Amino acid sequence: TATKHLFVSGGVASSLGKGLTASSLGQLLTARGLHVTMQKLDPYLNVDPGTMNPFQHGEVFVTEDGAETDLDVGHYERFLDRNLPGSANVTTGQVYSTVIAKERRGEYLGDTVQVIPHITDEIKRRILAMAQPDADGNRPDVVITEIGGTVGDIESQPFLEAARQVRHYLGREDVFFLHVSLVPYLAPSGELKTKPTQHSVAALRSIGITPDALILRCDRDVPEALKNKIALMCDVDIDGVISTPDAPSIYDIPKVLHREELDAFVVRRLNLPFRDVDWTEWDDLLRRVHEPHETVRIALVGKYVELSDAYLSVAEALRAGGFKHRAKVEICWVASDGCETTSGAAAALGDVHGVLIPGGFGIRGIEGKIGAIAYARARGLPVLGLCLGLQCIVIEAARSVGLTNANSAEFDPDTPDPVIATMGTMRLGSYPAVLEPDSVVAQAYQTTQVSERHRHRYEVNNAYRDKIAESGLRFSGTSPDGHLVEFVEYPPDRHPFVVGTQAHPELKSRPTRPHPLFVAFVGAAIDYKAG
Amino acid sequence: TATKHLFVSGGVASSLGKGLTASSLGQLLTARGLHVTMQKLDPYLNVDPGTMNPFQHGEVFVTEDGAETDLDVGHYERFLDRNLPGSANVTTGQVYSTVIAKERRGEYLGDTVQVIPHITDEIKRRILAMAQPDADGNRPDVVITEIGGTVGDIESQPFLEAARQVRHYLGREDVFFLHVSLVPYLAPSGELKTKPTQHSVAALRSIGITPDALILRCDRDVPEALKNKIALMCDVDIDGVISTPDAPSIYDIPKVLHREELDAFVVRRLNLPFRDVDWTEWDDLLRRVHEPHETVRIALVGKYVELSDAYLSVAEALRAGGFKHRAKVEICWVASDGCETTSGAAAALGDVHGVLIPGGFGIRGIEGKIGAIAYARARGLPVLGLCLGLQCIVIEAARSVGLTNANSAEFDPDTPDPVIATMGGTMRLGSYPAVLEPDSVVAQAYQTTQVSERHRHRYEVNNAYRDKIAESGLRFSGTSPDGHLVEFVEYPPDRHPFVVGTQAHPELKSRPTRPHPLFVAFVGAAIDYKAGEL
Ligand SMILES: [Ca+2]
Ligand SMILES: [Ca+2]
């Protein structure tokens, strides 16, 4: 059968949960036995979200191919269990750069390069690019493309036009349009208004797009009488009007959309092959979420506290590790700067059962993260260091030996002992790593050969390897040639669990398929909870 | 006094004469004794219009600094007599190319780059850049910025928004808004429609711009009773509503706007220094336009026929040369392809008095232009070759000598005799100096031994073939200061009265009030040819 295209558009208010709404539909379609790939059209002029502040706009997701993408790609990968390419994230900057480059080359044969067709054509080409067969020659069944930004925006105007152009290229039978809108509840009158959805569909119909289904994001349950009024008001089928109330968990949303029969409506409208939903895997996850046997507290020693979206994949990997042990993970958002002193670190990491050191990119406060490891080693708390975390474990290890001036060249260039230095060369995407047999990392992974996603340029100095080894720390994980240090660990006879990784395992972690390092880390924190 | 900004916005229909309406206002303000600089905002994504087809979108104007700009810059330069910089032509492509480069450099420091403010900021920076003092430290009095495209388009939306921010940042006393609209005449009812003007002003008011004056482009005279109705309908001052009927000539438009007192209204509203218009120079031009003593036919041997906008500066330079002799120039648009054969060239260039070979950039049909020179040399017609024209004179000169396979490397790369070749080579753009041979035809025209002209080419004359080309009688009268590059070629008067070729484009430096000496000498030579048939 021909490849289908589903477009998810957002109106009225922003950050409604449009990413999760689309991912949950992707989960249902994959559970129905279909090849589903997902794309996100960000309307900002930035080429890569790498230049953007992660503590203001969210974490930078890294794919297997080594592309810096939006955090929405992470939601897609977790809900599908499938690895996505770099082409899954399209920006206004990426499109406008490609079109201007071609114009300067003379690839438009003496024509006035305008948004329509030149820009809309490039967007259209990037959308239809997902329909091409992937690795092992597999063509997808349905492509869910999320058109970012509010319907009616200047930055969203060319992306919606390309989505409309695709609808006329393939036909009504191959293209579906889903629109997410907010239904607000007024406290003094005690009634929900249909006016925001009415003008949102009108703004979408003015640009030339007729929506097939409507997602009504609300705090309460939308009544059948009100749903019937919206159905006539927007000329949307009554079976297509979906009431999506605020779910207790993000993993409850696929069950909410299934109850409203949206997944069955999508298959029937696009004439896709029908097959019942296999809840066997998702029900096992829901049982681990709603029925936990234990509660474990794990501290996240990050630069900026409270904000979950700065370390979204890290927090999701921690919860995933907890589900394997059938326990609830309470993330303690600890500010790194407070752990600079041994007294301050003790007051912040006192009541916790585990300590995690995430990878800080372009940060300046490193001394706090080093101090957090120093306390955790003395108290006997399990430590999991990611990217900068491994670098901080190495600095603390060298400092405990006797090297008082041991630091990273990235933070202190005039250091007389640079234990962390370039060569430099930037590492992005999946990199292979050989593991030492019978080690803590080998016991977790249960294999001597692994592959993890990287995003850094600073490595462990090979000259200081002997001086660092004096602390007891062992370089269990190295590159195939053994030149680059990938994993560091303390033996169980010295510390139960102090493992550091140069890569980001949180990206490869899924709620249905948790990462073995996070499983071993959460498990070690449960062992700490006893006594 | 503080630098003023005037914004010209076009609505409803396109190509009505937005460029000419703005240039005529620029002419009046300069005639009132004010430093006027003009800017054109193009909404296309092309960084330089040099990549565009000239026979589809118009000629590509070259400034003194060496920038490829829109043909509207040419209208500004001719109506002001002032040389404009590369900053006078700002495109969507330029703005987006700068902001994306800035973003990648991290100059926006962890921020989501959006149209508002990042894009509008670059446009606002580009407009305010014209207000900066020019060469010898001279700051302009008023800056006329023309916003290309219809008011209401998504492509021209950030350019209008920047003008609104310029109005906000500087003030109402320093920023003026002019809107050009069409008033159509209905044949069955016999009345003018106010609806296209009302809907256009409403579209300008919806984006947040209140127009100060309205230009009503019409075929007939707009009545004072109708002008009063539109004034109230658009909330524009009655003294600001200007009726602009279709003028017989493009040089009549400044006189039309002066009669409606638009120039005086602009000065009064912006609180600019008032001084009466010095018509001394413009009236002399109008007399040469409307009262010609002679009529001379000059053929324009170009690849495409009839389309004037492809060779706009060339046609305007030809008319300018005619005004100096107080004569009307009838341009004969001749297709180059037809002049390939000697019989076809004779049938096309038979009744003409002068032959002109313009500069064809990115063209393929060169053999026709060579054949046109071959006939003109035999018939005894004056020849003026521009850029490719000089190259074609050189090829024809070498071919008459005996080199049957002599051609340009640009058109035939496998030629055994490349008389025209690069140096890969280097692209020459802008004003380049040239030393002239004393007592030569070009020196007699220019009346100086040292000249400067604007270039836009990559291929030069092969210095190895200089001796073989010289056998025809052709002399390299114009060369670079070092003498390595050939700039001008000419035949002696004892061989041919006027066969002059130039490597550069003199048509760009030609003005209606200040004509180019080469075009004056060429038109004059064509008048001499007419005298020879009596
Ligand atoms: Ca985001
Ligand atoms: Ca044009």
Numbering used by the authors:
A (entry chain A): 7 to 429, 444 to 551
B (entry chain B): 7 to 429, 443 to 553
Sentences from the paper on this structure:
The combined data indicate that 7947882 and 7904688 are prodrugs activated by the EthA monooxygenase, which then target PyrG, a cytidine triphosphate (CTP) synthetase catalyzing the ATP-dependent amination of uridine triphosphate (UTP) to form the essential pyrimidine nucleotide CTP. The crystal structure of PyrG was solved by molecular replacement on a 2.0-Å resolution data set. This structure showed a bidomain enzyme with an N-terminal amidoligase (ALase) domain, also commonly known as the synthetase domain (residues 1–278), connected through an interdomain linker (residues 279–Pro298) to a C-terminal glutamine amidotransferase (GATase) domain (residues 299–552), both domains displaying a Rossmann-like fold. On the other hand, the 34-residue C-terminal extension of M. tuberculosis PyrG, which has no predicted secondary structure or known function, could not be traced due to the lack of supporting electron density, suggesting a high degree of flexibility.
Indeed, another structure of the enzyme in the apo form at lower resolution (3.5 Å), revealed a homodimeric protein, each homodimer representing half of the functional tetramer and showing a dimerization surface of ∼1,350 Å2 per monomer, all in good agreement with previous structural studies (Endrizzi et al., 2004, 2005; Goto et al., 2004; Lauritsen et al., 2011).
